[PDB]
Amino acid sequence: EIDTILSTLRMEADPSLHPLFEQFEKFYEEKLWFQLSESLTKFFDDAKSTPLRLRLYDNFVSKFYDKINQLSVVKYLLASLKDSKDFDESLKYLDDLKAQFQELDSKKQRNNGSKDHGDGILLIDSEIARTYLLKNDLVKARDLLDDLEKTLDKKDSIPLRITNSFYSTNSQYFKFKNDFNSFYYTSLLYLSTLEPSTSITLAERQQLAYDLSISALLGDKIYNFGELLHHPIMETIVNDSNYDWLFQLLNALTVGDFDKFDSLIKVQISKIPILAQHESFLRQKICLMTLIETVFVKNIRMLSFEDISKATHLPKDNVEHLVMRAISLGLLKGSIDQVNELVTISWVQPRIISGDQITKMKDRLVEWNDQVEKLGKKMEARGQSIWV
């Protein structure tokens, strides 16, 4: 039965994937079901690419649809259905597994006597919305994302796996649509909750790393470019050519150099077509990032227009508008005097506190310790007589 299948799999398999197969059978015989889960997983980590994946799933699922925890079951199937090209086939298999699980859980809840099985379902649901995006039915996929988000969050406790799957689905939907703003929000989340699994391929990491950097050029509130670079997703992937000139842009934003910026952008505006259509945003973005830099360093409460004119190299007409933009972002607060040509900044938005600044804080706090101290001691002495 299951024996004839094991023969075909071993032979065309690599001779280094050969003993994985032998182990499967042995663990079944002995009824170690824990070990058995384990060995299955070892196959799908790295042999999901190969043509044998699909086969192993119909047979394995039918045999071990009761032994191993439920969440184990759906995870294996998922991997198989990425390399499954046909997206009507993917959708078929999904609905069969969805029914399967609902029935199973009814008995099984009572055998365990306690286990949340509503987890498996949510994962199934998540994947179906994913089918739809690939076939470009954004409308169906949308209301299914909605409902997912509500039930999940009503939960007071959630595993990483479930919320990770749901964010993946979202991420894909936002870049397809060509909405830079939304994707940036998702991508961050996805990174935070990211499974300790290394099943996540380098290719997947590299493609996301690419979309995040393009989002942040175009962005609506990102000035956090340095912080972003410090995370594994970009941090390691720097010698590659795609991640060179790219990262060069991020770093040009930090120092606000106008000159390096101009050279990069001229070449690359043709190359990446996202940047062509979003030209206004990108062009504003260098100018803004310079403005935030000039403002933060001069902590005095007023700046002439002349400071801005020179740093951003723009005419004065454009200056007061640029001053309107910062204020609309909420990055800055204050008022504009046109009669004297001033910007009175009255609020600065906190940024990354460098080491030097830790010392600065401390120096002022000592001074203000002393003031309280001097003042209490003298005033006790004054009118000492009455303190009932």
Place this chain on the structure above:
Amino acid sequence: MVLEATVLVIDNSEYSRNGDFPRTRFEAQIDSVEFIFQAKRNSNPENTVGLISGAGANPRVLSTFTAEFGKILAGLHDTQIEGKLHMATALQIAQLTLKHRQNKVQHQRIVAFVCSPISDSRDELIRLAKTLKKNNVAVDIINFGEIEQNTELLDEFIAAVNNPQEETSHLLTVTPGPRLLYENIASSPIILEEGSS
């Protein structure tokens, strides 16, 4: 054996959802928690048993020493099948539960199930071994998890710890293959043990 308070450690590691004991290893254990309570009672009806878990990061006191079958059962229903066994925590907590009792005349026994290999640090075990002697506690291990492929860290310790006395700590190694865990416990000494005095 006579007038005895027992902390039973029921463990529900990731290896306990297996099926070495047919049909399912979990269900063979459920029956054993029930049976242990009954065997001890049948000995001497003034015996009591309380319950703590091996499952999770840490133990949870489900039930203190009691005569009600009902408390052990509600506790038994509470499980997590992805729990994990840590030998050291279970021992330590068991001794503490023993310090307070409905009747403090009662003798001090730990029964613990082992359903996964044990890889806790050795240092921890050495020290616990002689702690136990201070407070004069005996312990019976129903072993069927450890032996499957991993040498016994506890046997020698228990052996050394025991004195001439009615109480007798033991290493009990019970055939781990399909034979039903509960059936084998009934058919081996657990209240047919003889005194050492």
